[PDB]
Symmetry: D2
Subunit: 114 residues, 4 copies
Amino acid sequence: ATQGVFTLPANTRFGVTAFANSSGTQTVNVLVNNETAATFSGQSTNNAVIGTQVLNSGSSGKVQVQVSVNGRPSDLVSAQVILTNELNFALVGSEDGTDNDYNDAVVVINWPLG
Amino acid sequence: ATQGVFTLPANTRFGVTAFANSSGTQTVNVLVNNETAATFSGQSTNNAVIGTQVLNSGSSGKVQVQVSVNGRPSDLVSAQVILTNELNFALVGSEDGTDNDYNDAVVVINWPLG
Amino acid sequence: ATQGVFTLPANTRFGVTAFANSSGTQTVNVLVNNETAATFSGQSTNNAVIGTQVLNSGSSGKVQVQVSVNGRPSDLVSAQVILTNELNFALVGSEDGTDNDYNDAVVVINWPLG
Amino acid sequence: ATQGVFTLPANTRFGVTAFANSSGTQTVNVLVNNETAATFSGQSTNNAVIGTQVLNSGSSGKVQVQVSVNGRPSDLVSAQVILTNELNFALVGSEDGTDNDYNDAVVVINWPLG
Ligand SMILES: [C]OC(=O)C1=N[N]N([C]2O[C]([C][O])[C](O[C]3O[C]([C])[C]([O])[C]([O])[C]3[O])[C]([O])[C]2[N]C([C])=O)=[C]1
Ligand SMILES: [C]OC(=O)C1=N[N]N([C]2O[C]([C][O])[C](O[C]3O[C]([C])[C]([O])[C]([O])[C]3[O])[C]([O])[C]2[N]C([C])=O)=[C]1
Ligand SMILES: [C]OC(=O)C1=N[N]N([C]2O[C]([C][O])[C](O[C]3O[C]([C])[C]([O])[C]([O])[C]3[O])[C]([O])[C]2[N]C([C])=O)=[C]1
Ligand SMILES: C[C@@H]1O[C@@H](O)[C@@H](O)[C@H](O)[C@@H]1O
Ligand SMILES: [Ca+2]
Ligand SMILES: [Ca+2]
Ligand SMILES: [Ca+2]
Ligand SMILES: [Ca+2]
Ligand SMILES: [Ca+2]
Ligand SMILES: [Ca+2]
Ligand SMILES: [Ca+2]
Ligand SMILES: [Ca+2]
């Protein structure tokens, strides 16, 4: 199944934050309406924050996370969770190798803000 | 029900990251085995990362998040989600007022690392 | 924090199914737009299905689950989880006593149907 | 990533319940420690509860859900969510065709029981 794709409420600000846990340099692209809206990159084996930004979901609300390492897309896993019918998390893990820890880039999207 | 309390695997590193979305200064305390192990404070209405840290869950695995604004405890919500039977997120929202957006401090705990 | 309240897309059919795990008889009420739409009753300590039904979320999309045991409101826990940006679960547990297993009535709402 | 595989508490009873939403007849197989422990089947476009059973997770706790329609494996999506650090849901969706509603067989595993 498709992973890393989320429909947010239209025209809504959201946070996006990426963490790295791998030998390899992670590039995380955040798409809004099928165009790149932000790109983060970095390398850490200690969960460093490699980027964080506030974006608008735009007219369609379609947000997609893609991760590439060493020139190839990582395999993604994702889900959305909503707490007390108010607080939204869109969560992404990714695997760049063979160990299947799925933490090589971890991406957290949260909304609403403010 | 109790919120903001999670049992992690023992002696395991985890990440903890706090975001703020309120006019009030947030104080986030992260307790491991009932003792404060990290503290973050700050004011943002735009999802600032008021702190991120790597901690060790220690012998007990017990991790608790508390949030307050100038000493008044915020009301918490929380849950844990596991992706592909491997990747863990422990999620906390908090409310410091009456609007019930539950984003006033947001805390994400993730493991494994590395 | 309020629990057991979910906003569904408007005018959408959804399933609601309840299970019991308690010596007490569980009564589960399901409200749509603040009006009772289904009621299930039963007793089991073996996870029996005490009711299942299909409802429509109507113009507001507001769905609420309440649980009581001999008229005493149970404390609730809840969350919503969306897989592949398509499949929705609204999940409720409830506690009628002191052991805090929160399984005394378990309610699963799922959509879309069909 | 692998989907539909969950590590449960060892030696512990859990509920497993399947719902159908497709023109195709669903077959759901539940494996405990790699051996078939339950099979459910039916055909509904209105969320029929085609099976529900209590199983024991056995010595290893490994539980796997597979879904097929007329002998062809469906694509699976899954996650586990934990409420108040104790109430667990392992969730599976599946797709037998091209519309990507992932509801064609829906499986919910819940524990603890009793
Ligand atoms: C006098 O005293 C004081 O200072 C005050 N008053 N009122 N207030 C309020 O509070 C609240 C709670 O905290 C707040 O809210 C917050 O923030 C906002 C922005 C949002 O975010 C929400 O959500 C939160 O909760 C408000 O703001 C305030 N107001 C004013 C006017 O300040 C305080
Ligand atoms: C006379 O009075 C009466 O009835 C009583 N007492 N006590 N009790 C109790 O309660 C409780 C609460 O509800 C119960 O718990 C329940 O169930 C069980 C089995 C389990 O499940 C739990 O979790 C729940 O919560 C109990 O059982 C009882 N006990 C007796 C002996 O009965 C009542
Ligand atoms: C002749 O051939 C046959 O058999 C067929 N064709 N087409 N089909 C289709 O398929 C599909 C897949 O499976 C189906 O889908 C299902 O169901 C529906 C109702 C819904 O639920 C969905 O989601 C699912 O997936 C369809 O139905 C069909 N169509 C017709 C018309 O049949 C088969
Ligand atoms: C240090 C290692 O780097 C890459 O091989 C990752 O895929 C592994 O998960 C691990 O983080
Ligand atoms: Ca890896
Ligand atoms: Ca890694
Ligand atoms: Ca607030
Ligand atoms: Ca706020
Ligand atoms: Ca109980
Ligand atoms: Ca019980
Ligand atoms: Ca389908
Ligand atoms: Ca279907």
